[PDB]
Curated annotation (Swiss-Prot):
Transmembrane segments: none annotated. The gene is LYZ. The active site is at E35, D52. It comes from Gallus gallus. One of its GO terms (molecular function) is beta-N-acetylglucosaminidase activity. This is Lysozyme C.
Length: 129
């Protein structure tokens, strides 16, 4: 599913991401924009052989199982395919674990390079929330 901007903002809020670990909703929307362009089916292979999955490009090296990432963990206890669903529950639940891991949203290099320090509130401007 390719979400609209405000559509995804609403869904992230309903699933409890707004101000989760102190990160306002715009941070999450901005991260999703630059990770996946709001496409739940986005996948990208990493040079290390891991793959990133879904709207928040959650990596198979630590968080999900895809059966082809040697030496990796599955700390979210999910198949990576679950992160590609039109239902964002698995991606949200797993992101809550990631952002709790110690480095906050810096776990998402795209967030650090493209969202951090910016006017992230613009990403929710105009949305019915």
């Amino acid at each position: 599913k390719v979400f609209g901007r405000c559509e995804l903002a609403a869904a992230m809020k309903r699933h409890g991401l707004d101000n989760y670990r102190g990160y306002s909703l715009g941070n999450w929307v901005c991260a999703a924009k630059f990770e996946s362009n709001f496409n739940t089916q986005a996948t990208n292979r990493n040079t290390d052989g891991s793959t990133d999955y879904g709207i928040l490009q959650i990596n198979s090296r630590w968080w999900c199982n895809d059966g082809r990432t040697p030496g990796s963990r599955n700390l979210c206890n999910i198949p990576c395919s679950a992160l590609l669903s039109s239902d964002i529950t698995a991606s949200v639940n797993c992101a809550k674990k990631i952002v709790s891991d110690g480095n906050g949203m810096n776990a998402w290099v795209a967030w650090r390079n493209r969202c951090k320090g910016t006017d992230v509130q613009a990403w929710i401007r105009g949305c019915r929330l």
